[PDB]
Design an enzyme around this catalytic site. Structure first.
Site, PDB file in Angstrom:
ATOM      1  N   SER A  45       1.692   1.940  -2.739  1.00 56.65           N
ATOM      2  CA  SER A  45       1.779   2.142  -1.302  1.00 56.65           C
ATOM      3  C   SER A  45       2.010   0.856  -0.501  1.00 56.65           C
ATOM      4  O   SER A  45       2.223   0.932   0.712  1.00 56.65           O
ATOM      5  CB  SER A  45       0.510   2.818  -0.730  1.00 56.65           C
ATOM      6  OG  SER A  45       0.396   4.181  -1.073  1.00 56.65           O
ATOM      7  N   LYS A  48       4.712   0.278   2.289  1.00 61.03           N
ATOM      8  CA  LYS A  48       4.641   0.861   3.623  1.00 61.03           C
ATOM      9  C   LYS A  48       4.492  -0.197   4.706  1.00 61.03           C
ATOM     10  O   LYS A  48       4.914   0.012   5.851  1.00 61.03           O
ATOM     11  CB  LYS A  48       3.476   1.853   3.708  1.00 61.03           C
ATOM     12  CG  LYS A  48       3.610   3.041   2.792  1.00 61.03           C
ATOM     13  CD  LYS A  48       2.358   3.878   2.782  1.00 61.03           C
ATOM     14  CE  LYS A  48       2.320   4.911   1.692  1.00 61.03           C
ATOM     15  NZ  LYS A  48       1.008   5.631   1.681  1.00 61.03           N
ATOM     16  N   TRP A  80      -2.906  13.030   0.105  1.00 61.74           N
ATOM     17  CA  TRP A  80      -3.325  11.818   0.803  1.00 61.74           C
ATOM     18  C   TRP A  80      -2.518  11.593   2.081  1.00 61.74           C
ATOM     19  O   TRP A  80      -1.888  10.544   2.249  1.00 61.74           O
ATOM     20  CB  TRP A  80      -3.225  10.583  -0.113  1.00 61.74           C
ATOM     21  CG  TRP A  80      -4.166  10.548  -1.311  1.00 61.74           C
ATOM     22  CD1 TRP A  80      -5.509  10.282  -1.297  1.00 61.74           C
ATOM     23  CD2 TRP A  80      -3.816  10.749  -2.692  1.00 61.74           C
ATOM     24  NE1 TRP A  80      -6.015  10.320  -2.575  1.00 61.74           N
ATOM     25  CE2 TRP A  80      -4.998  10.606  -3.448  1.00 61.74           C
ATOM     26  CE3 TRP A  80      -2.623  11.042  -3.359  1.00 61.74           C
ATOM     27  CZ2 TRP A  80      -5.020  10.750  -4.836  1.00 61.74           C
ATOM     28  CZ3 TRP A  80      -2.648  11.187  -4.737  1.00 61.74           C
ATOM     29  CH2 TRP A  80      -3.838  11.039  -5.460  1.00 61.74           C
ATOM     30  N   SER A 105      -2.647   4.450   4.896  1.00 61.19           N
ATOM     31  CA  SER A 105      -1.763   4.688   3.768  1.00 61.19           C
ATOM     32  C   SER A 105      -1.413   6.171   3.672  1.00 61.19           C
ATOM     33  O   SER A 105      -1.404   6.764   2.596  1.00 61.19           O
ATOM     34  CB  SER A 105      -2.350   4.150   2.476  1.00 61.19           C
ATOM     35  OG  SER A 105      -1.284   3.720   1.641  1.00 61.19           O
ATOM     36  N   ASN A 107       0.594   9.204   3.140  1.00 60.35           N
ATOM     37  CA  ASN A 107       1.786   9.326   2.294  1.00 60.35           C
ATOM     38  C   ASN A 107       2.890  10.112   2.990  1.00 60.35           C
ATOM     39  O   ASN A 107       4.063   9.724   2.922  1.00 60.35           O
ATOM     40  CB  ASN A 107       1.418   9.977   0.964  1.00 60.35           C
ATOM     41  CG  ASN A 107       0.701   9.022   0.005  1.00 60.35           C
ATOM     42  OD1 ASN A 107       0.950   7.804  -0.026  1.00 60.35           O
ATOM     43  ND2 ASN A 107      -0.146   9.587  -0.810  1.00 60.35           N
ATOM     44  N   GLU A 143       6.661   9.883  -6.494  1.00 60.05           N
ATOM     45  CA  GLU A 143       7.255   9.454  -7.758  1.00 60.05           C
ATOM     46  C   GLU A 143       7.275   7.942  -7.908  1.00 60.05           C
ATOM     47  O   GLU A 143       7.232   7.424  -9.035  1.00 60.05           O
ATOM     48  CB  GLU A 143       8.687   9.987  -7.860  1.00 60.05           C
ATOM     49  CG  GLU A 143       8.805  11.486  -8.051  1.00 60.05           C
ATOM     50  CD  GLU A 143       8.684  12.278  -6.753  1.00 60.05           C
ATOM     51  OE1 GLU A 143       8.784  11.686  -5.657  1.00 60.05           O
ATOM     52  OE2 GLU A 143       8.494  13.510  -6.832  1.00 60.05           O
ATOM     53  N   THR A 210      -2.664  -2.292   1.477  1.00 59.28           N
ATOM     54  CA  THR A 210      -3.055  -2.003   0.111  1.00 59.28           C
ATOM     55  C   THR A 210      -2.031  -1.125  -0.603  1.00 59.28           C
ATOM     56  O   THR A 210      -1.185  -0.460  -0.005  1.00 59.28           O
ATOM     57  CB  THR A 210      -4.422  -1.294   0.088  1.00 59.28           C
ATOM     58  OG1 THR A 210      -4.336  -0.109   0.889  1.00 59.28           O
ATOM     59  CG2 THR A 210      -5.499  -2.209   0.628  1.00 59.28           C
ATOM     60  N   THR A 212      -2.249   1.550  -4.308  1.00 55.59           N
ATOM     61  CA  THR A 212      -2.992   2.054  -5.458  1.00 55.59           C
ATOM     62  C   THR A 212      -2.131   3.109  -6.152  1.00 55.59           C
ATOM     63  O   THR A 212      -1.955   4.197  -5.618  1.00 55.59           O
ATOM     64  CB  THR A 212      -4.330   2.645  -5.028  1.00 55.59           C
ATOM     65  OG1 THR A 212      -5.013   1.699  -4.208  1.00 55.59           O
ATOM     66  CG2 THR A 212      -5.152   2.942  -6.265  1.00 55.59           C
TER      67      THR A 212
HETATM   68  C1  LIG Z   1      -0.322   4.293  -2.141  1.00 52.06           C
HETATM   69  O1  LIG Z   1      -0.545   3.535  -3.055  1.00 52.06           O
HETATM   70  C2  LIG Z   1      -0.848   5.747  -2.179  1.00 52.06           C
HETATM   71  N1  LIG Z   1      -1.467   6.013  -3.469  1.00 52.06           N
HETATM   72  C3  LIG Z   1      -1.434   7.279  -4.056  1.00 52.06           C
HETATM   73  O2  LIG Z   1      -0.870   8.221  -3.485  1.00 52.06           O
HETATM   74  C4  LIG Z   1      -2.144   7.573  -5.485  1.00 52.06           C
HETATM   75  N2  LIG Z   1      -3.399   7.165  -5.558  1.00 52.06           N
HETATM   76  O3  LIG Z   1      -4.208   7.308  -6.660  1.00 52.06           O
HETATM   77  C5  LIG Z   1      -5.575   6.953  -6.351  1.00 52.06           C
HETATM   78  C6  LIG Z   1      -1.337   8.278  -6.594  1.00 52.06           C
HETATM   79  C7  LIG Z   1      -0.020   8.656  -6.367  1.00 52.06           C
HETATM   80  S1  LIG Z   1       0.576   9.439  -7.847  1.00 52.06           S
HETATM   81  C8  LIG Z   1      -1.000   9.230  -8.761  1.00 52.06           C
HETATM   82  N3  LIG Z   1      -1.210   9.667 -10.126  1.00 52.06           N
HETATM   83  N4  LIG Z   1      -1.869   8.599  -7.909  1.00 52.06           N
HETATM   84  C9  LIG Z   1      -1.903   5.860  -0.989  1.00 52.06           C
HETATM   85  N5  LIG Z   1      -2.501   4.498  -0.808  1.00 52.06           N
HETATM   86  C10 LIG Z   1      -3.792   4.171  -0.874  1.00 52.06           C
HETATM   87  C11 LIG Z   1      -3.969   2.534  -0.872  1.00 52.06           C
HETATM   88  O4  LIG Z   1      -3.296   2.006  -0.007  1.00 52.06           O
HETATM   89  O5  LIG Z   1      -4.699   2.051  -1.728  1.00 52.06           O
HETATM   90  C12 LIG Z   1      -4.973   4.975  -1.696  1.00 52.06           C
HETATM   91  C13 LIG Z   1      -6.143   4.477  -2.164  1.00 52.06           C
HETATM   92  C14 LIG Z   1      -4.625   6.405  -2.089  1.00 52.06           C
HETATM   93  S2  LIG Z   1      -3.190   7.124  -1.254  1.00 52.06           S
END
Ligand SMILES: *C(=O)[C@@H](NC(=O)/C(=N/OC)c1csc(N)n1)[C@@H]1N=C(C(=O)O)C(=C)CS1
Length: 268
Positions: A45, A48, A80, A105, A107, A143, A210, A212
């Protein structure tokens, strides 16, 4: 002026069980800390933040862009999307979508904005326009988070992230009003309290974004930090690990940020 002071990044990544990439620049002196800084790591993420900067850049040409209302259907919501789901029935402005993408974050907000910018290639084009030849975005959410070992899609390097963040928040890549708006969005981020911010004293200003990915121990944070009485520091901390089920660690990101600041001689 690179790595004037050795710091135990290798022990830290060995304890973590993966790889850590760090770049940090003291914008006053030019001194830097660099560890795996030119390796590619998944953006997750963290793209962004640059997406919001690209929106701000476009708004310099399109006066009313930021206040444009955007209406979207339920199919635009992806997991999210904590802000955009609350305005499904009303719509949100471009500026509100940008703030949500940066600060929560969100989505779905990011996907909507990416579409407005012409997709991953359009965001990549913006990064090329500020001189970043490393960044590449290739796919949409979710993806782009696959974080496959050795896959260069949807990656950048800690060094390129930091250099581009510097240009956008402190340099001339954005006009001054847009620059301060970008800084303000980053300062308001809510998702980074256990990452770079955990290494930064409470009385210093910080803005961060951030990422993740959810797999392969892959997570990250980049930030601009304003210690009082000296020039700002820009830094990026990216992680990955070899196994799909490896967990990321916020504490490792904070620890790496601490080591970066120590390596620059910034007293915290
Ligand atoms: C950006 O990194 C987004 N991350 C996610 O959507 C996922 N998070 O897993 C905990 C994901 C997508 S596909 C998969 N198997 N997992 C958003 N960004 C934040 C961030 O900025 O850290 C989040 C903690 C979760 S949503």
């Amino acid at each position: 002026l690179t790595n004037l002071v050795a710091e135990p990044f290798a022990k830290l990544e060995q304890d973590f069980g993966g790889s850590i990439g760090v770049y940090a620049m003291d914008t006053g002196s030019g001194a830097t800390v660099s560890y795996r800084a030119e390796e590619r790591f998944p953006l997750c993420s963290s793209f962004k933040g640059f997406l919001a900067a690209a929106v701000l850049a476009r708004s310099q040409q399109q006066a009313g862009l930021l206040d444009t209302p955007i209406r979207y259907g339920k199919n635009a919501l992806v997991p999210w999307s904590p802000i955009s789901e609350k305005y499904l029935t009303t719509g949100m402005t471009v500026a509100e979508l940008s703030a949500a993408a940066v600060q929560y974050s969100d989505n779905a907000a990011a996907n909507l904005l990416l579409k407005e910018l012409g997709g991953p290639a359009g965001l990549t084009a913006f990064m090329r326009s500020i001189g970043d030849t490393t960044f590449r975005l290739d796919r949409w959410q979710l993806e782009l988070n696959s974080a496959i070992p050795g896959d260069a899609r949807d990656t950048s390097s800690p060094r390129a992230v930091t250099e581009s963040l510097q240009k956008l928040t402190l340099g001339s890549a954005l006009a001054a009003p847009q620059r301060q708006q970008f800084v303000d969005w980053l300062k308001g981020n809510t998702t980074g309290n256990h990452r770079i911010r955990a290494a930064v004293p409470a009385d210093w200003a910080v803005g961060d974004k951030t990422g993740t990915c959810g797999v392969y121990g892959t997570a990250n944070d980049y930030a601009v930090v304003w210690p009082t009485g000296r020039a700002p520091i820009v830094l990026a901390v990216y992680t990955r690990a070899p196994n799909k089920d490896d967990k990321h660690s916020e504490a490792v990101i904070a620890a790496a940020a601490r080591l970066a600041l120590e390596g620059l001689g910034v007293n915290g």
